[PDB]
């Protein structure tokens, strides 16, 4: 069951009607302006920060969902319909939205009117701009007023959505219907005051009217679908003081068949340096220059069709440094466009802001950005080395971090929690990624200050010595890592014991003392303790690197000793002493998360993928067999059916959702890797193909949210709704998706000397190459590939017999050709 | 301009159109449970506290607004209407609300079919029940199924808002159509957890079909003016898993040519103790036993109609201890109904939850609870005692307070700000108004914590010594009490100077150090500094007492010599000395706050009204020229027109609104009780009048929100929407304005020892009589009024003259009949 489809030489997802299972969005912007825009043009915009600079004002869990955009009223001859369809619902002849990379187009025709228009942010503006198309596609002349309609926020989201006892008071605008390309409308609310920033939304003609009173728009008692004005086929030229601010403007147009007219409008964000806010002596009069120069840059549709292009350009250049060519047209879409696109959104949003999450409490990501790292530092490298500068320097000087930092000012905070033990390792993770993907390694004498206090600056280096030391420091009876507040899972909360109704498990405070305890970060710490310890000794310190080998030696025993119950890795200890993670208890016996960490890290691996002994082996046959579905694998099984007091936020969801029992994308990868390392490509590949959104395409009724990224969490196996998704795009599933696929099931992947090529994809995939920029140098990979269990690679490199799996990093401007036998 | 009217004998306000200029609301409620009602039936339920225990969903700002309530779609024929009017706004032929106290009652017929809802919150019980009619007003036989809905809110209302990646996977249901009085669904949505309630919404009879899921209900793209179920004629028995649990129930009515039928419904609010928490041994059902029960108590017509009547008779007997039978019937349902019911509801809600604060961030406000109690003591005084141990118990022991309390919790918290150095000096004008009122001696020996710290107990006496002391000890070079972070003005912020935007004002640091002065203050200490002196004299604390004198007496000589700006009092001083509210400044030249409140406390009073060199007079003709307008006395002019860095929020106000230039109500009061100190009674009455809901209910149209209780703010001269409010319900201004009529116009106010009968109204109110339960007796109080200006009041008590104005209290059951002559 679909509701459009994949266009690949267009790099679009195509869908071909309103009637959706769920708002389907794009992201607009890559650099520090962005937009949220659904498939009926519902959204928001802001810039740098959905909480603190959101420009346009967005309901979540509005009734019914997405009523609520830029919209686009036509009222011919009386009639009025929106071509995004909502909020006017009126039938339309026909409808299209493509969601593409950087930009949409969102096409609607009623009665011989045919309205398309092109959303997109422009490379280097901090700005939504549409260019609207109308066209006449019946045999009599056509009139229409088209009424544009974009409402305000107050900037401050939180204050926006709770604190009308102040703000219904300050809404301010001013209205220029006569500017220098045509009509805007300012809105300018706190200007007065402490914001050096309005927004203008304009169009390039001069409007017959306007509106930025949303009351007078929409008028008393009519929701969106209903607004008074373009009914009335007029605007009133309403003027705003308090209430609700919106921009709107009026043009009426006048078509023979065939003919069309385009319009172009802009939404932007403008600041002024403090001395030249203002346009008067008095400081009543906002200065209008930077908002007029951006209406400049796009008075016409030529300018706009240029920025459009220079931002396919952009795409094109990003996605040339990785892209395959196989059989499998489903694996080449996602490697080539829509698993890469993803990565970059992930890395410019973290997890605070889609269609779930709200973009208030949430920020950048201390855990989330590193993971996002690992499948970013190949799109944009200089962007990647400036966000780890960023992340480490909310770093504490015991290796501890913030949680998050807040995107308008980088400065961490405790918004959503403290002392989460596996964030310290991930900075490591992070790092290495970076530095064996660009061979930067002066990134490790960068001065990098701790929690951003001028003057407490240290190497960026010393950092992860602190985010080793910190874990080596904090280990518990059994040699493991101690767990605080939670690991990588959230709602594995050993330290909590809250019986207080509300609290929020993330931020409520924890017990001291216990003996917690978490397998996760001791994997966590092996496999990127070994990173740590390879850089130490690149640096040339030696007896640091030695001690450090040590310490991942014991820890790596550790595990083996006392986190294995028998057919898999225990998940934990609890603050008691007490395993977690047991077959002995009745529910939560097998969680994936160190299943499929600790065999990455090589834990319990042995001969090959036929070895049955190996522990390794037993963990994942034990993760296929309990924790395997149609949709993916579950977190862990049996999911609990009562709250569990010892273990936290975790048992608090039903069954089958979210941490106890969903299928937790974010941790599937990790299975995906585990099962290459041990040899089975088949079955790492079977997998991915489980979670994929190419894949899942003809279960979009089943999915539900978007087809073309990937999600948070699909309900498992015990839901009942078992396959549907929920927290759609905003997810380090993305990253570690293509980590898997285009590093180890694919098999190409960057090391600190040369570039690693080890298939290990099973015999779905039996003939592919891949192109791969990589230190400067075109690696082109022509793949060979039997998929025999257990079977890797050998390779020739320009007609030479190489040694081993490692082709050592050739030239900058060379091209090499790697040939790959399986 | 109206859109209903007042009904006296009723004691309603009978709105008789849905097109009102803005929702007008009810509180349903009086002990722990309230419901926000508007007269469309939009609105929510919660249990204690509006944050932390919501039981059902609303949408602030809504499009269009007040979409959203307890809503009964009816289906005759396949036309489907709702009586409310909205969501689905059909024509009906007949439609009325009536708000009364504590019940409200809507009415809508359309095509032969009357539906009327009465709702209310019974005495006892933590519940809101409908009983419903449904009458066939046409000749022949109908028959139509009526369709309950009701959105239930996850109990957390600010994680219900802003945590769906969350709380999405957590809404969980049982549904019971065959339970012992009817049908039940039960919302139960974290009781797996920490949460020991659920609610329930029922009805009295075996439902057709039932709904739990919205998204089911209302339909894909639908609001819920076109909810798809109703529509369809049939529920879809949907059992909710996550996403948007709901109440819903069809139930196929019958009626002969006449005929009516009675349905109650009940939303309850129900908790289990933990031990009994389940019916099953896997606890997976709720034990419904708590449920059953209330729907047993309110099963029947008879059940609902004798608790709605033991409501009424509770009005009846909070209403006899104050009333007034004069020539003017809008005076008398003021002081007789709506300004009593209206400080009923300050008392319980604070200014936490209304159609204008969102019941989130704000609680039991210190300062708020305190001018609260000043309106409320006469009502239920042993609920004003209790009040007052909860506030003084969130009292540091340095005499500084948190600003508000947690309503659930009782505990402080600093959410909206902390050191408001006017906070402390409410408690005793709290201490001072009860024990004058109730002759309670013994609630200063009351042990109180500190922050509620086990074993700081200490007498209530102690914590007012506590509060004088802080004023006393922060004192600033002119003599006059140190600001800190604000005083009664939240906006004035003199040791701010915030340049960073989006940072509250009422929340952001502030620096230390500087001389800011606050005049109001002063006043304030002057005022009630005395009677904290008289309570010490009345505990033989001659000492404590004399020198309490003694600073009152520094403070008045202080605002006399450095407080005086030639015509009217200043209002403070900034953090570098500099003179605010000053002719010498262009705007801001003169504020109301300490004009009223340095008057109040005798400060500038001279030989009468008609003394021109006193400075009370001066002041006060400054105050009705530079700050009068139609509407009430606007808070300062001329209002700020650019940002004053050195002043805090204050200036942020577009001119006209909230504290730049609003008539900000609550301070009006003052002026009007200077007024009547100075002997202007005809002038503090007109005062009185511009303010007052059943006065301005003439221009309904002009004041927007409910003509009969009053707001905190009506936009002033300098506003282009002059004469429109915002911010109705809660508010200071009804307890002040509750303290002017009835204790100082109308003359009549208690004091430690005896009943000042003193009235000072002008000639308007040329006679009347107050009938005043105090101490256990009844003051029937026969007023002749010239309303001479300046003539006070001489009195003759049972037949004989006595000296002075004041009664000495008689014995408990004794009628005291009081002849007054002014
Ligand atoms: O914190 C509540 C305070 O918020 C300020 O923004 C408003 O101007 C005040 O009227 C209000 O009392
Ligand atoms: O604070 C963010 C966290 O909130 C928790 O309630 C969720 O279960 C986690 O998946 C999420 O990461
Ligand atoms: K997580
Ligand atoms: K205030």
């Keep these: 069951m679909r509701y459009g489809h994949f266009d690949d030489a267009a790099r679009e997802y195509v869908i071909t009607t309103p009637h959706t299972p769920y708002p389907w969005i794009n992201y607009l912007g890559s650099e520090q302006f962005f937009s949220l825009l659904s498939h009926q043009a519902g959204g928001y915009s ?81 700005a939504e701009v549409q260019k609207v198309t109308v066209t006449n596609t019946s045999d009599a002349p056509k009139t229409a007023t088209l009424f544009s309609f974009v409402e305000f926020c107050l900037w401050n989201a939180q204050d926006d959505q709770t604190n009308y006892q102040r703000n219904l008071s300050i809404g301010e605008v001013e209205v220029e219907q006569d500017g220098p390309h045509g009509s805007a409308i300012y809105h300018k609310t706190e200007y007065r005051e402490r914001r050096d920033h309005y927004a203008v939304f304009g169009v390039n003609t001069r409007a017959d009217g306007f509106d930025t009173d949303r009351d007078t728009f929409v008028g008393a008692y009519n ?46 964000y403008l600041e002024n340096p403090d001395e030249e806010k203002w346009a008067d002596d ?41 892209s395959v060519s196989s059989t499998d047209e489903k694996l080449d879409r996602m490697v080539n466009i829509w698993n890469q696109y993803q990565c970059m959104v992930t890395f410019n949003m973290s997890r605070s802001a889609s269609f779930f999450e709200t973009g208030i409490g949430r920020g950048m990501g201390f855990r989330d950005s590193n993971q996002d790292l690992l499948g970013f530092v190949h799109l944009i490298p200089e962007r990647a080395r400036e966000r780890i500068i960023d992340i480490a320097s909310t770093q504490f000087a015991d290796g501890s971090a913030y949680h998050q930092y807040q995107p308008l000012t980088k400065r961490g905070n405790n918004d959503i929690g403290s002392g989460f033990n596996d964030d310290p390792l991930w900075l490591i993770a992070g790092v290495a990624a970076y530095i064996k993907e660009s061979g930067d390694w002066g990134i490790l004498d960068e001065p990098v200050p701790f929690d951003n206090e001028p003057g407490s600056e240290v190497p960026l280096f010393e950092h992860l010595t602190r985010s080793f030391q910190f874990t080596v420091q904090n280990r518990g009876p059994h040699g493991l890592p101690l767990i605080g507040r939670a690991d990588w899972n959230d709602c594995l909360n050993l330290n909590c014991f809250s019986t207080t109704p509300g609290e929020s498990f993330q931020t409520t405070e924890n017990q001291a003392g216990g003996v917690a305890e978490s397998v996760f970060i001791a994997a966590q710490f092996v496999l990127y303790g070994a990173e740590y310890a390879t850089l130490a000794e690149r640096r040339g310190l030696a007896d640091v690197a030695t001690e450090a080998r040590k310490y991942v030696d014991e820890v790596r025993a550790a595990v083996l000793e006392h986190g294995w119950d028998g057919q898999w890795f225990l998940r934990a200890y609890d603050y008691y002493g007490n395993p977690v993670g047991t077959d002995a208890k009745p529910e939560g016996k097998i969680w994936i998360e160190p299943q499929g960490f600790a065999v990455m890290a090589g834990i319990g691996v042995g001969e090959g993928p036929d070895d049955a002994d190996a522990p390794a082996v037993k963990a994942l046959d034990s993760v296929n067999e309990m924790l395997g579905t149609p949709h993916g694998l579950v977190l862990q099984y049996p999911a609990y059916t009562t709250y569990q007091i010892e273990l936290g936020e975790v048992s608090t969801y039903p069954p089958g959702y979210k941490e106890n029992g969903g299928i937790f994308c974010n941790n599937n990868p990790w299975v995906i890797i585990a099962e290459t390392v041990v040899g089975r490509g088949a079955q790492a590949f079977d997998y991915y193909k489980r979670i994929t959104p190419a894949y899942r395409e003809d ?43 285009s590093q180890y099931l694919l098999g190409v992947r960057p090391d600190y000397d ?56 050739a030239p900058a401007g060379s091209t090499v050709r790697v040939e790959v036998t399986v």
Tied chains: 1, 2.
Excluded: C
């Design 46 to 126: 802001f810039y740098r920060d959905a909480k603190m600079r959101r420009l346009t004002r967005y309901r979540y869990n509005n009734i019914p969902a997405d009523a609520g955009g830029r919209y686009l009223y036509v009222n011919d001859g009386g009639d009025v319909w929106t071509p995004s369809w909502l909020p006017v619902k009126a039938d339309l002849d026909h409808f299209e939205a493509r969601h593409g990379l950087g930009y949409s187009r969102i096409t609607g025709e009623r009665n011989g009117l045919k309205v398309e228009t092109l959303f997109f942010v422009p490379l280097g503006e901090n």
């Design 223 to 268: 929701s969106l679908g209903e607004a008074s004005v373009p009914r009335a086929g007029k605007s009133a030229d309403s003027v705003a003081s308090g209430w609700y601010p919106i921009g709107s403007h009026s043009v009426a147009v006048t078509l023979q068949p065939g003919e069309s007219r385009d319009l172009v409008y802009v939404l932007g």
């Design 754 to 809: 040369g570039l690693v090529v080890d298939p290990q994809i099973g015999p779905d995939v039996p003939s592919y190459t891949v192109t791969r920029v990589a230190r400067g140098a075109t690696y082109e990979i022509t793949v060979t590939n039997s998929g025999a269990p257990g079977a890797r690679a050998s390779l020739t490199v320009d007609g030479a017999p190489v040694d081993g799996r490692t082709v050592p990093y």
């Design 699 to 741: 279960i979009s009724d089943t999915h539900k949210l978007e087809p073309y990224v990937y999600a948070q969490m699909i309900a498992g196996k015990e839901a009942v709704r078992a396959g549907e998704a929920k927290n759609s795009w905003l997810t380090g599933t993305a990253a570690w998706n293509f980590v898997a696929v």
């Design 282 to 322: 008095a400081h009543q009069v906002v200065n209008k220059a930077p908002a007029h120069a951006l209406l400049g840059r796009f008075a016409t549709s030529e300018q706009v069709d240029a920025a459009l292009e220079a931002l396919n350009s952009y795409w094109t250049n990003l996605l040339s440094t990785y």
